[PDB]
Each structure stands twice: as structure tokens, then as C-alpha cells.
Ligand binder design. Sequence first.
Ligand code: NA
Lengths: 30, 21
Amino acid sequence: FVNQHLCGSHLVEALYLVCGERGFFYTPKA
Amino acid sequence: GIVEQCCTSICSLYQLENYCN
Ligand code: NA
């Protein structure tokens, strides 16, 4: 699920699943 | 940033994990 174009909620979902209990930062403007 | 690497080009686990805390 990671090796494709991921945008918007699809990208947040991938971060959520991969990062697990670490959590993540979603900084689209950086 | 993440949009350029994973939305307008193809994402990778290596890259995604750079955004985990
Ligand atoms: Na999870």
C-alpha cells in the first residue's frame, strides 16, 4: 500500500498504519 | 516535502518512516 502515489487522506492513512504507536507528523506545506 | 515525495511522485516506506515520530 506504500509504493504508489498517496495523497490527502490516503497519505495520512499510510502514515498512520506505518508509524503505529510512534505517531507521525503530516506537514504538507513543508 | 512529503507531498512532493509521496503524492506527486511514488511514495516509499523509507520516505514515509522519515515522518514517524
Ligand atoms: Na496502526
